[PDB]
């Protein structure tokens, strides 16, 4: 049988790889690779293709007398077969982070926290007023005891000085309200706002919060082509004013935000903090546990299972942590789309829906495999052959998950 699981295991991870390989040209040709739902996606494509080639390398290590040689590119294949299994993990973990922050925070939040900043504790402003959050006034009493109850009133529970992210939220969508009352009551603003879609909308109030109202209304020509859906030309009249001058990046993602009608301008720079997750740190992870076996466990390429001393756990551990947080993070979101989210039915939590639905499904397939690891008749035969497809496959489960979110 032991013949037949090998084969069987050739014979799905030349699938898996194949799949995976599809799947990442698929994302590349994709113009919505700019999203960073798909930036996810093709990083966590690419982190399950690394490890199924190095499983074929990994194959060569195996024969004795080089296992037990343990020469010095073997132990780089283990090392490197191992590095690109904690990568699998935190790029899974990657997707889980943006899932449970998709549903929690607002795009126009996160767009607002990278060009005016997030402060969670009060401070005061440039002309001395107290202010939390993303440029949200308290009040103008000079007395800080004053204003922790003034916040108080604003968040409806005593804050002593420090608000939750999630209530920085609700301060700030209770703001783009005020902005959104101020835009149509403006003569000038309101044609224009009406005839925008909601991304756009969103670089108008952008606007709004660092000019005011009397500020944006100001740029007639841009303005009018904005209304006449000509972004290109809105786009050139745009940089002309100083705003651009003074605040350049800022400026050029909001300017880029009207051109494409996308959030391009604004992914780009939340992707590298995804990026870190999952390439970023697990490479000092395995660069400890290659120190850990240099030590105390140099033999046989670094893969000999010796009961013995845990250095596995060194890179085993942080991917069981970062399986338990996402199990956190499910459970949150989970409980959100039935307990706010029942009725909303808005593209963003359609897109939830059908994310978590796919999470439910492929948590099974990859889990069960780890299940059966820990516990050891024809039916032991159904085991060794269960396992030897599971594991093999994992890479074309991984493939057709990703194609289904994206759709
Ligand atoms: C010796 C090696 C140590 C090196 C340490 C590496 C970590 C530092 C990395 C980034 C710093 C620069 C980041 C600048 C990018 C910020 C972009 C942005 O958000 O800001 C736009 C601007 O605020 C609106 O005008
Ligand atoms: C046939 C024998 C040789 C073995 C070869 C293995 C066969 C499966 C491999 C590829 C399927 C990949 C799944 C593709 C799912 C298509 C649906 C899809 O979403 O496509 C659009 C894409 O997401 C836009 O970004
Ligand atoms: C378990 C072994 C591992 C091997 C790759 N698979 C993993 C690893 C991780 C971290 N998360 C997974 O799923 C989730 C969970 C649990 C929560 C959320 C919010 C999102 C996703 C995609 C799977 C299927
Ligand atoms: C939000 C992610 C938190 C990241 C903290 C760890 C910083 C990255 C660690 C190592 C990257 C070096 C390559």
Known sequence: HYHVAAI?????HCISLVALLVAFVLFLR????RCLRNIIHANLIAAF????????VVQLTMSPEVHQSNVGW???????????HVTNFFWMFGEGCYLHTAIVLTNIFEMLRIDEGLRLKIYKDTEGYYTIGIGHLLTKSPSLSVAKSELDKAIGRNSNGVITKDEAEKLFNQDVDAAVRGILRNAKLKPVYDSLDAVRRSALINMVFQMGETGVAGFTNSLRMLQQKRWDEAAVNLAKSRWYNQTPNRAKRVIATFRTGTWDAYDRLRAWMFICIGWGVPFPIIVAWAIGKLYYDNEKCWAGKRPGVYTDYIYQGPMALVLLINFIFLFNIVRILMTKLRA???????????????????????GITYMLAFVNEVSRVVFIYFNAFLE???????????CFLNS
């Open 49 to 56: 293709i690394l490890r199924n080639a190095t499983w074929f």
């Open 74 to 84: 073997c132990r780089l294949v283990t090392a490197a077969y191992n590095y690109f």
């Open 392 to 402: 093999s496959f994992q890479g074309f489960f991984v493939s057709v998950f990703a």
């Open 30 to 33: 994709a113009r919505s690779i």
């Open 344 to 366: 909303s039915t808005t593209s963003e939590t359609i897109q939830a829906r059908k994310a978590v639905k796919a999470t439910l499904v492929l948590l099974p397939l990859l």
């Open 8 to 12: 069987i295991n050739y014979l799905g």
